[PDB]
Each structure stands twice: as C-alpha cells, then as structure tokens.
Design a protein around this ligand. Structure first.
Ligand SMILES: *C(=O)CCCC[C@@H]1SC[C@@H]2NC(=O)N[C@@H]21
Ligand SMILES: [Mn+2]
Ligand SMILES: [Mn+2]
Lengths: 94, 762, 192, 95, 91
C-alpha cells in the first residue's frame, strides 16, 4: 500500500532503510544538508532533495516544516525517522 | 586485472538470507539489479529472470527447469544513462564540438535565474484559458476589442533564429519558462516553434523539438503558444502530400500549439488551403499571412505590389476564414509611413484583427510599430531587449517607453522584461560562436530586399566563389533577378532561388539577354529550375514563357499546387518500419518527424542511443564538456540528478585512447575516448616485457619510417617487418623466429623510445 | 548655447525642477546671451519621442534661434525622437553613418533618410553617398575591435539611472576592478 | 601595443576607398562658404529658412568616442575626407 | 636556402594572399587541409573541388572560381592554415 518512502535521516541508517524499501519495491526519497551534498546516502535513493539552502548543518534534519514541505513536493506516503533526530520527536510525528 | 581463459569463470559468488524464501528471493534480485560489470558479458539478467520466475518461487521445480522454461533466455538490453553522459562529456572535452572554437570552457557571468512558483502560475488566466473558453473565433473578437496593443514575444524562436542560427537550446528556454509565464501573463502569444527550430533541434542540437513544446507547455500554461507554418510543407524541406500537413497540425495542436501563422512564400492563397483546414479541424487559431515586398509609398516600385493588391489579398484570406491577418515583413521593408497606410486600409477593408511581424534590419523597426499602432494594429511581434534589434524583432522594452505620452499603451510588464533581458544577455554569451556577421543597420535592404539573414549568408557564399570583391554586383544582380523572374515575394525558399540565380549570373558573366540566348547550353541552378517547374507554387505574375523554356530544357511544369501530385503517406508502414528499427515505444510525434525529416530523424536516434538526452545538459557543458577538477550537476528529473566530477585525463595509449577519471556521485569511474590528435606522435607506448620472447622492443629512440606488418601475418624468420630511423639512419627490424604477429604498437611516423614495445610474435 | 537634457518632461512625478518651463526659461536666457544657435544635448538618450515633440515644439515659440538637437540611441528610440523632433520643426540634427551608429552612438542617418519617406520633411543629404561611406567605416571599424564596447543591445534602464553615453560599461569595469562587479545591481540603484 | 590583444597581425578585409578630385571639391560652395559671406547670424538666418532637416555628421567625433573609446585615428578620417566632402556637401556641419 | 627534412611537417609559413588579385584564392577561416585534390599544371573547370579543409570539425570544400589552370598549390594534406593564407593560384 506504500508507494514512496522518505527517510528523515542520513548515513548508514538511511541507506539501510532505503535498502529495505527497495527490496519491498517501494520508491525512496532522501534528504540532505550542505556539507552532506557528498554523503553517500544521498545517492542511494530514487530521489534526493536539499532541505533549504538557508538551513545550516545539524538544524536541517531537525526542521519539521521544511522536511514535510519536501515530503509533499514528492507525494510521499511514509516517513522513516530512523534514529537520533526527529526519530523521538512528538511534534514531527503529529 | 583482466581475466584469463585457463580457469573456470567465477566473477562473484552471491548469497542471500532472510526469514522466508520470498524475502531472500527479493533480496537476491535487488542485489542482482545493483550488480554492474563491464568490459565482459555476464549471466546476470539470466539469473534475474530465474529468481523472478513464479515456478522458482513456487519451490516445485526440478532439474528440467531450464529446458522447460524458455522465458529465461529472453533477456532485455541494458542501457546506462550515466555512462553515456560520461561518454558524451568525455568526447566533447577531448575533441571539441563542431563550429565551436576549440577553447577552454569559459567562465561566464553567473547571473542567477529568476523563477516564479508553479502554484502562482496555475492561478493565472491568460489568452490560453481564453481559447479553451471562447474558441478561436472568440479570441479574435476579444483581440479587436482591446484598446491596448497586444504583444507576441519571439525570444523563443525568431529572435534567436535571426541572431544565433537558431541554436538556443531547450535548456535555456525551460530555465526562464516560469518567469516568462508571469512576465507575459497578458501577452497575446509566445512564438516558440516552427521556422527552423524543428530542423535545427533534431539535427544540430540533437534534441527533440516535441519535448521543447511539451515542457514549455507545462511551464507556461496561461499564454497562447504560436508557431510559424509554411503552407506547402509545414516545417519540412521538400514537398508533401496533404495528409502529412494534417497529421503534423493535429499533433502540433495536441502538444500545445494554439496559434498557427500560415504563410505561402509567394502569397499564393491556393497553397494555403490545406494548412488552414487542418488547423480548423484542430479547433485552433489559424493566422492567415500576407508577406510584404515592394513599397506602397513609391508608385515606381511595382504596378503589382500596391495597396490594392494587399487589400484584395486580405479579403480573400478573410473569406477563407482565417481568424487573424498577419503581415510578415520578413525583410523589414515596411517603412513607417507605409505601415500607417497599409494597416489603416487593412482595418477598413477586413474585420479580422491585424497581427504585424517585422524585422529591425533597417533600424526603423520601432518607428514602423509606432506607426502601425497609430493606425490601429492589434498585435505586434517583439523580443526582449538583449535578443532584439537588427535582423531580429524590434525591442519590446523600448517600444514600451517609446509609446509614453501617445494615445495607446503596450500591454506588458517592463519590470519583468528588464529582468528577462538581463537573463537573455548572459545566456546569449553561451552562443557566441553562432553570432551573426551583421552588427549594423542596413538600408540597402530597400533595393535588393534580401530577407532576414541572407545578405550575410550570400556574402559568405559569394566569397566562396571568389566574388568577395564584387558583392555590389551580386546585390545588383539579386535585384535584377527579382525583376527577371517577374518581381516575386522573397522568403525561404523563393529568396534562395534569387540568390542562387544571382550568384550564377555574376559568376557566368550573364545578363537578362544572354540568359535567354545561351540558355540552351546552360545548367541553371537546381533551385531555379525547381522554381520554374512549379515546385514552390505559382508566383503572382506567372512565369515568363521563354525564360521558363530555357531553364526547363523541355521538362514539364506542374499545372497545380505541388501537393495534389503526391500519394498520401502510408503511416502504418511508417510505424511498422520504426518499431522494427527501434525498440518498441513509438508515437505519432515520432511518425511525422520521420516523415518530415527522414535522414535527420534517423540520426537523432543514433545519437539518443549513444548519448541519451543531451537536452538536459546545461549549455556550457553541452558545447565544451568539462575541465579538470570541475563538478557539474545534471538535472534528470525532480529529485534525480547526476553529480559528475572530472578528476583528470591521462595521456593516450598506443591506440590514441585516453582514460578519463570521473567521480559520478559517490562512485569512482573510468571511461575511454579515442583522441583525434591531428598528426600522430604523442601516443604512450607500453614498455616491453624484457624476459618475454614474444615481446619485441625498441633498442633506440627513433621514428617509424615504414610499417610492413599488421595483426595476423605469417612469414618466416628474418622478415623485414618494421623500418626505423635512429638519427638519420635506417635500421630494418627483423623477426627472431617463424610466427604470427599479435600486436603492432606503431604506425608510420610515430616517435619511439628506448625499451618501447613494438611487435609481439608467437 | 546648449541645454543639457535630464529628467522626463512627460512625467510630472519625475521632477518639479526639470520641467518644460525650466527649459523655456533657459532657452530665453541663452538667446539673451547672444548665442547664434540653441543646442539640445541629450547625453544620456533620455529625450523620449513625445517629449522631443513637446520640448522642441515649445522651444520654437519661445525663441527665434534655430534648434540643434543631439541625442544618443542608447535606449534604441533615437530615430523615433528625431522623427518626433522633425515634426516639431527642429532645424538641425546630429546623425552618424549606419556602420558607426546605434546604441551609445547617434541615430543612423541612413535609417532616418528612409524613415521620413512619406512624411512632410526630407533629410537633406545623399544616401547613395551615405551607403558608400557606411561600407567604408564598416571595414575601418574592424581595425578597432580591441576597443569595441561590450554593449550589444538597447537598454531602457537608462531612464532609471540616467547614466550618460559611455559611463554604464566604464562604471561596470570599475566595479569589477574593485570586487563589486557582482553586485552592480546596487551600484545602479546607488547611482540613481 | 597598449590595450591591444597581443596576437599576430589580424586579417582585414580590403577597404575600397571612394575618392573625389580636389577640383570638384574646390568648386563646391556649402555652409563654410556661407559663413564667409554672411557671418554667424546670417548662417543662423539661413538655417531657420530651410524646409529640409539639416544634419551634422558625428562619425569623426562623437560616434567613435561612444563606440570605440575615441580611438579612431586621423589616417582613417583622412582617407575618406574627399568622399565626405562630397556626401555631406549640403550638411550643416561635421562634428 | 636549405630544405628542412620534415622536422615540422606543417610549420611551413604560407605567403598571404593578395586580396586584390582574382588568381589568388585565400583561406576564409583558420583550419586544416584535409585533402589536396589538384596539383600544379592541371586544368580545372569552374566549381571544381580543388581542396578540402576542416575548420572546427566542419568540412568545407574549396572550389575553382573560374575555368583555368593551377599554377601553385601552397599546401599539403594535414597542413594548418590561418585566415588569409594563399592556397591556390589559377589563371
Ligand atoms: C565531435 O563530433 C564530438 C561529438 C559531439 C557530437 C555533438 S552531439 C550534437 C552535435 N551534433 C553533431 O552532429 N555533433 C554534435
Ligand atoms: Mn521572421
Ligand atoms: Mn554626445
């Protein structure tokens, strides 16, 4: 029932979630920041979007609004928060 | 390291593991699909088919599984988008681009691009929404009601067809599409298709013009799209049966064309019926066009091209039921006062709205528009400042301000136009290799009447025949040819006829009398004989019977428009051929594109297969490739982009093949490209293995004077197989044993060094 | 006696100083000084067509001096301004040979000659001669390609910043040659 | 040479130089002659009377100051002087 | 005068064409000679290919302006040329 997945995260966990989604024929979406325009998880998804030029380094995986803005612009059904960012965030999930 | 045939072939052993046969099975195909090996062929797609197979996932299978399941040897070809992109950039980087001055990729002005939110654009209701609302008859009635002067922008088509040999790529157009949509929100239409764009898109720029139409369509959904349609052959290069015109119109309408400016290059109405009908069946706006020549101000110019001729012609186009009347002044001949008198009369004579197109080649362009506006013209063709002037349209930016304090306003957004102008000024920089010769207004236009570009094209052509010092005579002859042929409208391809004839007459010391006297022993240019056969149609005054005779040497001329002679094209047959030649996914747009441009279209495809969608490259990269250390970012789709870094290029090997070291988004990557050195001496030879009896090496630095053997030659020991040059001294290299040559590392004239491998013999 | 043109007499919001009445008064004053001719020097090509008609229209009444008009075609409305000046009764205009005209230069004489066809007033000159000179200058100009301006198109922003003749491209180089050649936008606005 | 791109002498098209004899020009009588006969005020008077628009050419001055940083040399002006004398024989002035 | 024994192959300096001479055919653009199609003493017709050049990956074929005779061929295959160099003289 899930067509597209977005991972609100980076690095090994992102790639990991991507790999499962792919094995489930689910299309993948990745987010990245400025110094992560190199990080490998960006290239392991079907689609990759920058979370706002403006948004800095750590804060850009925290920005609830901008990340959801991305999720809409792609028609994503589901977000996997991974671990250690918005993964425990209440406001983000709501 | 390479693979030897002496051990059983094992590339990689792959193993998957999970809770269920279903999950491990889908773990396997996933890892199989990520697998990529090159330089050799693999059993990869085979296994993929095996895993996917329901009978394998069933578990019930036996040893006879492969022999009984014939689908497993039916594997689909594997293209690679990314590699082909690397291949293109590599080629252009090393061996340059045709007609582009081989220079290091320039560091242009950045000049970032103005954009507008697509949700805002979606809220705009312009002339496109008006066509969908009130039909083509109703758009016309709306136009003639507008007190403001409505503009058509020509930046996407005519503007660069004039100034840049039509080289402006889709990429630069799509980049400002959203800004343009806002800027021209109240515009009548954007001219973005037809003329040379079809031809030039497929051939030179190697991009699909249909893609350009379709993408601009989505991005600019509020303004009318307009194309220029030549009555005889839509956008082709020869003649066509009527069903080719119809098809192309139907499919042009479907992909987003709303306004078709239909013109005949002789103002022959009868050749304009097909395009007209077709456009009407498509429910789109059909613009009926009068081309301007002569000078209605001057009664000595012609007894034919008078005010009464244009009036008569206009009323015939009205009874033909064109929704709009276009005046195509393709040579910028419409003088200010002429404009005011012509339009004024045309307003009174017909009820159609008048749409005026001029070129600024005399420098009086804006004056002409200003006068036309005064006389009540409904629509004019303009371009943004930086893409205007000279052989292009008059500038919209300045027309805007030129009108200040006069009783009629040009309905547009200047602020926007300034911005568009800035964008087009930086972008034009990319096209510097295709800049026109012309840098100045030219009023000799008014005597020889060469349209658009030609007065430079023909000078180039006249220099080729060594008449460079006698161009005035050529220009003089062009004018005489016009009267010799009976005073004709001169637009492609009729103007080509006159230029060809003129070149021909000057080159052959021929005048109006000798062309008839000696004509029995003269091979007149194909374009004139063609013209005198009836193949562009009928010129207003007809053909001079004796001049026709002398040129035709007894060939029949047509007794009707070129169209009625040809069989309808069997399009099913066209589809059959294409689907066989290609994969499978073929469309109607593919079909007429083939019909209209067979050889060109076939070449577009061989390029698509080899290099992919070149139209997605930014223009600098497309023309120059990449320099060392550079990173470029190629937009494939929303969220899908290739980040490529060129790291270094190696010296060429013994085959002139250079190795490019790329990084393609996170991955190391190596590509090979043959370098056309221009001469051969810079090739890096492999060092001979010294303790190898097969490998023959070079004993001294020298040259390859002569090559005597190639791959697969068998002669006895002591055969003189390679002649060298030590230092003004020839030494004849001989074979140590009877055997066969495996590799010859050199060709005649290559520099060699001490210990370089030359020959290998078994 | 020369009057340099700035502002825009067509736009009452542009200036309550550089109005028609200011120009008339300055003309009458220069006539009082005993100049033999009245020049209008439009150095920044700011004399819009309808403004030309009105200004020269009003000046012919105010003073008895013949009027000598000089503009630059930097906005691309040069010829229009001239044609409109001629309708207003202007005596002498500054033109240049086609191949030496346009953009920051004066309007093309060659172009004006024909532009006026059908109109009440003819340009007194020899086009066949002008065409012939034009060709000559077209080749000679070629010897000076290292000195060509960067300007290859008309610029209507001159109505905002009023930068005279050359300056625009000159001032861009200074900006580049000072590490501001990116933000020439704010320079243009700062000039204004 | 200053401000000139160090490169081998570029190829130039041949300039046909149209030429008028000095006696044909010595016979002309234009605005120069009028000033000698009538003075500045008379020249002004004569201008006011003319129907035609009169012109002042700027090729030798303001045209190349605008387009070519005023670099046009005497020599290039000198070569067409005699043709210019003829073309603009009815001109008001030459800037 | 000493002939250089192919130690540059193409770095021969071509005399520039007298542009006011009809018999002189000069190079319109910089580029390379791809194929010499005629030699000295040969009779040619008008519009006959004499020479093929390659400028920027584009091949132009240089043709005889008038019926006549080749009197000097200035280039060989592979030689580079600059705008204005004499290539052929025909009468
Ligand atoms: C030199 O030929 C390098 C290959 C570049 C090919 C490109 S693709 C589009 C242009 N059309 C064409 O025939 N070649 C150019
Ligand atoms: Mn056109
Ligand atoms: Mn000035």
């Amino acid at each position: 029932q899930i067509k597209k997945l977005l991972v609100a995260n980076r690095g090994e966990i992102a790639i990991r979630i991507f790999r499962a989604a792919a094995e489930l024929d689910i299309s993948t979406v990745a987010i990245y920041s400025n110094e992560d325009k190199s990080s490998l998880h960006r290239y392991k998804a079907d689609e990759s979007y920058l979370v706002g030029s403006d948004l800095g380094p750590a804060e850009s995986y925290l920005n609830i609004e901008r990340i959801i803005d991305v999720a809409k612009q792609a028609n994503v059904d589901a977000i996997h928060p991974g671990y250690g960012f918005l993964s425990e965030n209440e406001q983000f999930a709501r | 390291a390479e693979i030897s045939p002496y051990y059983d072939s094992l590339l990689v052993k792959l193993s998957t593991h999970a809770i269920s046969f279903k999950q491990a099975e889908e773990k396997m195909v996933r890892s199989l699909r990520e697998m990529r090996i090159r330089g050799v062929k693999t059993n990869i797609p085979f296994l993929i088919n095996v895993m996917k197979n329901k009978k394998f996932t069933s578990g019930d299978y036996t040893t006879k599984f492969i022999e009984e399941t014939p689908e497993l040897f039916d594997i689909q070809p594997s293209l690679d988008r990314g590699t082909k992109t690397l291949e293109y950039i590599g080629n252009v980087t090393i061996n340059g681009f045709p007609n582009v001055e081989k220079r290091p990729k320039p560091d242009y002005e950045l000049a970032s691009i103005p954009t507008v939110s697509s949700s805002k654009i979606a809220s705009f209701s312009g002339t496109k929404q008006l066509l969908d609302e009130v039909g083509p008859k109703g758009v016309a009635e709306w136009v003639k009601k507008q007190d403001d002067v409505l503009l058509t922008d020509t930046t996407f088509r005519d503007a660069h067809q004039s100034l840049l040999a039509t080289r402006v790529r889709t990429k630069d157009m799509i980049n400002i599409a959203s800004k343009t949509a806002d800027v021209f929100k109240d515009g009548f239409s954007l001219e973005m298709w037809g003329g040379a764009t079809f031809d030039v898109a497929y051939n030179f720029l190697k991009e699909n013009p249909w893609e350009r139409l379709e993408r601009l369509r989505k991005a600019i959904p509020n303004v009318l799209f307009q194309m220029l349609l030549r009555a005889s052959n839509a956008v082709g290069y020869k003649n066509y049966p009527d069903n080719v015109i119809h098809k192309f119109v139907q499919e042009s309408a479907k992909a987003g064309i709303d306004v078709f400016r239909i013109f005949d290059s002789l103002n022959w109405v009868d050749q304009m019926k097909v395009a007209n009908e077709a456009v009407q069946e498509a429910g789109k706006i059909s613009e009926g066009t009068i081309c301007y020549t002569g000078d209605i101000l001057n009664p000595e110019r012609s007894n034919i091209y008078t005010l009464e001729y244009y009036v008569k012609l206009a009323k015939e186009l009205e009874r033909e039921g064109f929704h709009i009347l276009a005046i195509k002044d393709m040579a910028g001949l419409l003088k200010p006062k002429a404009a005011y008198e012509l339009i004024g009369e045309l307003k009174s004579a017909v009820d159609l709205p008048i749409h005026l197109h001029t070129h600024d080649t005399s420098g009086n362009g804006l004056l002409t528009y200003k006068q036309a506006i005064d006389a009540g013209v409904d629509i004019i063709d303009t371009a943004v400042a930086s893409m205007s002037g000279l052989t292009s349209q008059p500038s919209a930016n300045s027309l805007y301000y030129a009108l200040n304090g006069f009783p009629r306003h040009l309905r547009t957004d200047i602020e926007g136009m300034e911005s568009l102008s800035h964008y087009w000024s930086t972008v034009r920089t990319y096209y510097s290799d295709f800049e026109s010769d012309i840098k100045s207004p030219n009023t000799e236009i008014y005597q020889h009447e060469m349209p658009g570009g030609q007065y430079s094209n023909l000078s180039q052509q006249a220099k080729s025949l060594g008449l460079g010092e006698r161009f005035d005579e050529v220009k003089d002859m062009y004018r005489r040819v016009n009267f010799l042929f009976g005073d004709i409208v001169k637009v492609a391809p009729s103007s080509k006829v006159v230029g060809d004839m003129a070149l021909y007459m000057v080159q052959n010391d021929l005048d109006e009398q000798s062309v008839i006297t000696d004509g029995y022993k003269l091979d007149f240019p194909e374009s004139v004989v063609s013209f005198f056969k009836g193949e562009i149609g009928q010129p207003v005054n007809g053909f001079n019977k004796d001049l026709q005779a002398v040129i035709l040497k007894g060939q029949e001329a047509l007794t009707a428009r070129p169209g009625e002679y040809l069989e309808p094209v069997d399009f099913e047959k066209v589809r059959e051929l294409l689907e066989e030649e290609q994969q499978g996914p073929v469309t109607e747009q593919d079909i007429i594109s083939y019909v209209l441009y067979p050889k060109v279209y076939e070449q577009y495809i061989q390029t698509r297969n080899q290099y992919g969608n070149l139209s997605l490259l930014d223009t600098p990269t497309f023309f120059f490739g990449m320099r060392n250390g550079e990173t470029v970012e190629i937009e494939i789709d929303k969220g899908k982009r290739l980040i490529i870094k060129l790291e270094t290029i190696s010296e060429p090997d013994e085959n002139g093949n250079r190795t490019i070291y790329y990084a393609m988004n996170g991955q190391a990557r190596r590509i090979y490209i043959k370098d056309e050195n221009v001469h051969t001496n810079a090739n890096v030879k492999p060092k001979a293995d010294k303790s190898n009896p097969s490998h023959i090496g070079a004993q001294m630095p020298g040259s390859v004077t002569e090559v005597k053997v190639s791959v697969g030659e068998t002669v006895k020991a002591n055969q003189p197989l390679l002649i060298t040059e030590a230092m003004k001294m020839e030494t004849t290299i001989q074979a140590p044993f009877d055997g066969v040559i495996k590799q010859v590392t050199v060709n005649n004239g290559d520099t060699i060094a001490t210990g370089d491998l030359l020959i290998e013999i078994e």
